[PDB]
Amino acid sequence: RARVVCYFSNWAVYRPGVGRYGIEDIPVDMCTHIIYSFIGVTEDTQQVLIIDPELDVDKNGFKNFTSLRSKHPGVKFTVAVGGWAEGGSKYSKMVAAKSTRMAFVRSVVDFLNKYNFDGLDLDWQYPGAADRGGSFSDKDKFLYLVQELRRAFIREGKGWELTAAVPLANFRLMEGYHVPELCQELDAIHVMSYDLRGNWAGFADVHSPLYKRPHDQWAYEKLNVNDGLQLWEDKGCPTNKLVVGIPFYGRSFTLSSGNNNYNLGTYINKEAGGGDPAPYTNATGFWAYYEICTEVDTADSKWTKKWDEHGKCPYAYKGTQWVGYEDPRSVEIKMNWIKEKGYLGAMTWAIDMDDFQGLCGEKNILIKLLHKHMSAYTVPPPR
Numbered sequence: 262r263a264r265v266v267c268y269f270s271n272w273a274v275y276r277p278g279v280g281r282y283g284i285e286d287i288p289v290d291m292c293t294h295i296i297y298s299f300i301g302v303t304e305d306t307q308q309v310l311i312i313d314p315e316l317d318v319d320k321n322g323f324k325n326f327t328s329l330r331s332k333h334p335g336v337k338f339t340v341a342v343g344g345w346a347e348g349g350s351k352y353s354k355m356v357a358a359k360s361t362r363m364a365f366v367r368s369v370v371d372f373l374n375k376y377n378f379d380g381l382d383l384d385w386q387y388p389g390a391a392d393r394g395g396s397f398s399d400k401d402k403f404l405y406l407v408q409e410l411r412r413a414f415i416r417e418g419k420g421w422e423l424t425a426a427v428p429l430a431n432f433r434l435m436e437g438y439h440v441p442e443l444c445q446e447l448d449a450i451h452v453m454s455y456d457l458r459g460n461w462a463g464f465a466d467v468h469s470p471l472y473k474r475p476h477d478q479w480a481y482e483k484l485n486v487n488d489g490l491q492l493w494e495d496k497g498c499p500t501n502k503l504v505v506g507i508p509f510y511g512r513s514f515t516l517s518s519g520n521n522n523y524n525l526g527t528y529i530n531k532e533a534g535g536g537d538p539a540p541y542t543n544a545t546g547f548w549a550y551y552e553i554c555t556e557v558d559t560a561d562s563k564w565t566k567k568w569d570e571h572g573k574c575p576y577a578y579k580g581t582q583w584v585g586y587e588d589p590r591s592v593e594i595k596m597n598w599i600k601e602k603g604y605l606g607a608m609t610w611a612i613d614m615d616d617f618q619g620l621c622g623e624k625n626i627l628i629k630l631l632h633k634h635m636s637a638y639t640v641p642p643p644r
């Protein structure tokens with residue numbers, strides 16, 4: 262009764278060579294819930310925005326995805342609205358008034374019906390965030406949107422789920438999330454327990470540390486997976502609504518010129534914007550898991566791999582390049598910790614970045630770990 266929640270990126274199909282990942286590559290049987298990412302909202306009319314219509318509609322992306330239920334009827338297939346690239350201002354604008362919320366809600370209902378989705382995942386990043394076009398009133402009005410969506414889903418009578426991807430930093434919770442009221446309306450809270458460190462922070466560090474490290478101070482003191490999930494509990498979310506995100510990617514850095522200190526917390530060349538882009542994801546500061554293992558794990562690799570003894574995450578470096586990530590050892594540790602805490606399950610961003618080709622060894626090695634641990638686990642009653 263635990264969840265294994267798999268986000269699927271619709272843009273992964275454009276990655277070159279062995280990076281190409283489409284609907285047919287999803288290992289459906291390893292997941293209990295799979296989420297097509299992303300749709301957005303229109304700026305002007307507050308309706309569902311289809312972001313890649315040639316792929317999503319003309320080549321039948323949405324329906325290929327949802328029709329996977331024919332062979333796997335026990336799996337739920339939903340869609341996510343929002344995500345980083347969509348920005349936050351259109352969402353803050355959409356929730357500002359009852360009328361614009363109801364237009365969005367109606368559009369959502371039409372969309373889910375048309376493409377046979379099982380529900381909606383809310384991925385607005387983030388209500389109340391000033392750097393993302395948000396403002397103070399988002400907190401109340403995001404809750405209203407959620408209540409109104411739930412009521413609309415009830416009226417449709419198809420048992421649709423409504424979930425949300427959420428941050429774990431306290432200031433973001435204070436700015437955007439009425440925790441007890443949201444957790445009551447949502448079927449699951451997908452906690453983004455990753456991107457907790459990165460180039461924007463100005464130092465090198467792993468991005469999903471499980472526990473506090475000695476160098477964690479001020480806004481970072483509690484910014485780790487364990488304390489962050491504890492924060493969601495403390496703010497009123499039941500343990501059996503919390504799903505813990507696991508990143509299948511690493512955050513990378515370019516170290517400062519002449520820096521020979523590779524320890525956690527070491528200074529970086531912030532203006533570089535992150536580590537050099539990798540060949541398949543082509544994004545500064547970001548490496549898919551398979552881009553990491555093909556570089557770090559080869560027999561003749563010149564990369565040095567280390568282990569964060571407190572955060573329980575690997576990191577690796579070579580030259581000016583430094584990457585923190587999750588590997589089978591760190592994922593296993595997190596799976597055991599999820600069961601120890603009694604949380605609802607595990608989530609991954611994102612299934613298209615697992616070693617799905619088996620370039621490094623076992624195909625789909627990371628999602629197999631989530632599936633192995635969660636499928637044998639019984640979620641206990643709320644604590």
Ligand SMILES: *[C@@H]1O[C@H](CO)[C@@H](O)[C@H](O)[C@H]1NC(C)=O
Nearest residue numbers: 283284285316320321322325
């Ligand atoms: C959907 O499936 C059809 C038939 O297999 C295929 O031709 C098409 O490329 C698929 N669309 C996408 C977006 O994967």
Ligand SMILES: *[C@@H]1O[C@H](CO)[C@@H](O)[C@H](O)[C@H]1NC(C)=O
Nearest residue numbers: 277538540541542543544545
């Ligand atoms: C890689 O990303 C950059 C933007 O950073 C883009 O301009 C460039 O065309 C991309 N290269 C490939 C091979 O897609």
